Write an enzyme that holds these catalytic residues in place. Structure first.
Site, PDB file in Angstrom:
ATOM      1  CG  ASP A  35     -12.318  -2.957   2.251  1.00  0.00           C
ATOM      2  OD1 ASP A  35     -11.451  -2.266   2.818  1.00  0.00           O
ATOM      3  OD2 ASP A  35     -12.251  -4.216   2.116  1.00  0.00           O
ATOM      4  CB  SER A 199       3.007   7.392   9.107  1.00  0.00           C
ATOM      5  OG  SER A 199       2.987   8.280  10.212  1.00  0.00           O
TER       6      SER A 199
END
EC number: 3.4.23.22
Length: 330
Positions: A35, A199
């Site tokens: 994770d 992004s």
């Protein structure tokens, strides 16, 4: 040194991935959920409340000659999906894919929430976010990657998750045969303890690319792709019959649909998520309403590039002095 381990979907929908991890002496192999969105290595154990164990493999520290109780240390964690676990702490030898760390904090669960109990395939979590998020008290502990880093050939690990198929976590090297083209690296902020990056935009299907900054985290421990409501609405508007359902808990779509792809930007590069990656199947057994793999982050407080996004790429988690993230197509 290096390590290389195969990671395997827990079910036919890729709801999560498990990776075998050797703990203790002799080794006890547990299948952990790696994770990158958290920083605790915790396991089901011989100390876990019996009624809360249902099919998981447990770590038994008393059977490990290298286990040592970390005196006075406790831990307690709550995850974004509302699940939680807590307990005490041992140090022990932990190996992943041939890479060994001695003195790793292994957090032994005394209590786990129902979603953990109910998932027999996950024996615990191995956190790969920054150690500043680790919950051990009163002495915060380091992640497996943080402990291994100095020994690694290169201070990196890579995630290469499969679509409905196994994939690979590598430590200490970049497998140049595992991706196509080049790896595009992008800046990371560690301020919130995550692999947080921005992004450069998105496209829906064959549509034009929208240049827009989307700050979010690369999180292998989250199944889906969570993005701003505007982005998510633009995606689902291209699917006949798709709608956001408050009763179900997100966007649903007719199972008869063919889903469009979704592209996200990494600098000037582009990662394309095929439409099929966005299908999570019926909302309930036998239903013709299917759950979408792109969902709104509104009210999470952060955008999350979970498995839906990451499995479309070869992803480098670069833990150099100034960390960065790399993405390649594959």
């Amino acid at each position: 040194s290096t390590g290389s381990a195969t990671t395997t979907p827990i079910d036919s929908l890729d709801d999560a991935y498990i990776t075998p991890v050797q703990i203790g002496t002799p080794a006890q192999t547990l299948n952990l959920d790696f994770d990158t969105g958290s920083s605790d290595l915790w396991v089901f154990s011989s100390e876990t409340t019996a009624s809360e164990v249902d099919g998981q493999t447990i770590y038994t520290p008393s059977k490990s000659t290298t286990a040592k109780l970390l005196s006075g240390a406790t831990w307690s964690i709550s995850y974004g999906d509302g699940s939680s676990s807590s307990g005490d702490v041992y140090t022990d030898t932990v190996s992943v894919g041939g890479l060994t760390v001695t003195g790793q904090a292994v957090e032994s669960a005394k209590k786990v929430s129902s979603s953990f109990t109910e998932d027999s395939t996950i024996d615990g979590l191995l956190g790969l976010a920054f150690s500043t998020l680790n919950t051990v008290s009163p002495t915060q502990q380091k992640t497996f990657f943080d402990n291994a880093k100095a020994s690694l050939d290169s201070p990196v690990f890579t995630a290469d998750l499969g679509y409905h198929a196994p994939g690979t976590y590598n430590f200490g090297f970049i497998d140049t045969t595992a991706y196509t083209g080049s790896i595009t690296y992008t800046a990371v902020s560690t301020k919130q303890g995550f692999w947080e990056w921005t992004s450069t935009g998105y496209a829906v299907g064959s549509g034009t690319f929208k240049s827009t900054s989307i700050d979010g985290i690369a999180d292998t421990g989250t199944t889906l792709l969570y993005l701003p409501a505007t982005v998510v609405s633009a995606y689902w508007a291209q699917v006949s019959g798709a709608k956001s359902s408050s009763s179900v808990g997100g966007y649903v779509f007719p199972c008869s649909a063919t889903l469009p792809s979704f592209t996200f930007g990494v600098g000037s590069a582009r990662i394309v998520i095929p439409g099929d990656y966005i299908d999570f199947g019926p909302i309930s057994t036998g239903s013709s309403s299917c759950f979408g793999g792109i969902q709104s982050s509104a009210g999470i407080g952060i955008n999350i590039f979970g498995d839906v996004a990451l499995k479309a790429a070869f992803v480098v988690f670069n833990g150099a002095t100034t960390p960065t993230l790399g993405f390649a197509s594959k």
